[PDB]
Amino acid sequence: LPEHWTDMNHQLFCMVQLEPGQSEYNTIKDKFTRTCSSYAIEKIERIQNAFLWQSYQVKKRQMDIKNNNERLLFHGTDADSVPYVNQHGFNRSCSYGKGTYFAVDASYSAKDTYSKPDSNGRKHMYVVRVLTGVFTKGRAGLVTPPPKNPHNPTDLFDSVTNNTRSPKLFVVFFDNQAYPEYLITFTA
Amino acid sequence: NLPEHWTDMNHQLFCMVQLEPGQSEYNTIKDKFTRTCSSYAIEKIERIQNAFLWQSYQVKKRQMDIKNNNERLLFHGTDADSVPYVNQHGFNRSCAGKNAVSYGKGTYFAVDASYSAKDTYSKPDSNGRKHMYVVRVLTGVFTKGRAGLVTPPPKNPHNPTDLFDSVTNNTRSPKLFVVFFDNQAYPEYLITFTA
Numbered sequence: 488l489p490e491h492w493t494d495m496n497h498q499l500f501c502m503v504q505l506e507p508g509q510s511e512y513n514t515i516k517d518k519f520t521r522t523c524s525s526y527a528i529e530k531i532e533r534i535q536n537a538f539l540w541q542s543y544q545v546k547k548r549q550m551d552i553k554n555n556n557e558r559l560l561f562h563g564t565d566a567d568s569v570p571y572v573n574q575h576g577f578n579r580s581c582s583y584g585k586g587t588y589f590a591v592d593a594s595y596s597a598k599d600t601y602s603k604p605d606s607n608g609r610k611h612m613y614v615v616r617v618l619t620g621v622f623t624k625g626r627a628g629l630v631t632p633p634p635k636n637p638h639n640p641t642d643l644f645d646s647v648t649n650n651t652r653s654p655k656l657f658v659v660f661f662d663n664q665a666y667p668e669y670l671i672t673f674t675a
Numbered sequence: 676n677l678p679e680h681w682t683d684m685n686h687q688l689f690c691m692v693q694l695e696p697g698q699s700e701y702n703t704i705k706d707k708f709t710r711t712c713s714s715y716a717i718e719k720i721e722r723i724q725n726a727f728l729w730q731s732y733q734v735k736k737r738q739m740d741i742k743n744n745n746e747r748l749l750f751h752g753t754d755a756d757s758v759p760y761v762n763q764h765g766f767n768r769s770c771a772g773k774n775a776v777s778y779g780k781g782t783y784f785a786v787d788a789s790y791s792a793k794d795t796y797s798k799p800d801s802n803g804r805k806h807m808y809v810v811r812v813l814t815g816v817f818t819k820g821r822a823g824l825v826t827p828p829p830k831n832p833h834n835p836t837d838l839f840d841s842v843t844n845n846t847r848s849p850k851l852f853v854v855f856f857d858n859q860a861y862p863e864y865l866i867t868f869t870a
């Protein structure tokens with residue numbers, strides 16, 4: 488488990504609210520305001536999920552071995568999906584393909600369509616480690632990433648993007664490819 | 676890290692190992708198959724040695740043993756065309772076929788081999804070969820399913836994140852299980868058989 492995590496008293500999951508003014512809080516704030524300077528951050532929480540982390544890191548080492556595979560991306564969701572995501576992560580079962588979507592810019596996940604405001608006006612987006620690895624442009628109807636070689640349909644790309652030259656979003660089609668690291672609660 | 680009974684796979688992240696009849700390993704799998712499919716003939720049995728699928732699955736199994744008898748050895752019949760993909764990548768619910776009677780949108784596994792042996796599942800290729808996997812499936816704690824499930828239901832309606840590990844057709848007498856997550860099943864053997 489990461490050293491910068493706080494003690495979880497032999498628990499496997501906990502949300503650790505960050506302290507403003509500290510490097511950790513500010514680093515995340517900086518990546519958000521970089522494109523969302525008009526929004527007001529209410530709080531930032533470090534998601535400490537021992538189980539999700541384990542599966543993700545296993546996935547990461549497999550990808551490093553099989554091929555710079557990790558990207559820090561954004562994911563805005565409604566309030567109701569937050570509890571599930573904290574515990575279980577991102578599910579494709581819940582358009583450049585039918586997987587989970589993650590934005591390069593926080594501005595993109597800030598849209599009400601994504602970070603849908605709750606009755607109190609709060610919006611939610613995750614700061615996510617995503618295993619984008621080797622990618623290709625996507626297309627609707629993808630249920631899995633395309634094969635690197637059409638004549639070896641089992642060697643797959645790790646993710647897809649909207650535009651390979653200037654990626655603004657990535658899509659992953661498997662469970663343990665995204666780790667929600669922080670949850671940003673913010674308002675207008 | 677990998678099972679010590681596995682053949683060397685040097686430099687391979689994966690390989691299919693053909694089993695020898697007369698062996699406990701081959702014979703036992705044959706016995707579980709013929710237990711309900713005595714009318715079919717087994718062409719061959721291959722052990723699936725997938726390093727990555729195994730690692731992920733075992734991490735997932737470790738986690739379900741802590742959170743909660745979570746593993747079942749079940750059958751999965753597929754067409755020939757899905758074999759290559761399942762060997763490398765395992766079972767995908769996004770590519771999963773609608774079951775005749777549906778208890779959710781995930782990958783299905785049978786208790787009896789007789790069930791998976793139906794042409795609708797282990798579809799005969801042009802040569803008449805049928806295919807089914809022997810799978811280690813993390814069923815864990817389960818409940819009766821229902822169509823339109825995209826994940827397992829919560830053990831409790833008011834704590835919607837604490838989920839069941841799988842769903843079945845009948846809790847008292849389970850003949851099939853459905854899993855909705857990627858590494859809850861490891862394809863351990865591939866049974867090729869004929870009429």
Ligand SMILES: CN(C)CC(=O)Nc1ccc2[nH]c(=O)c3ccccc3c2c1
Nearest residue numbers: 561562563564588589590595596601656
């Ligand atoms: C039908 N979908 C709109 C359901 C949904 O929840 N989508 C969703 C939900 C969250 C999303 N978060 C993102 O950062 C993002 C970035 C680029 C493109 C999409 C997203 C994004 C999309």
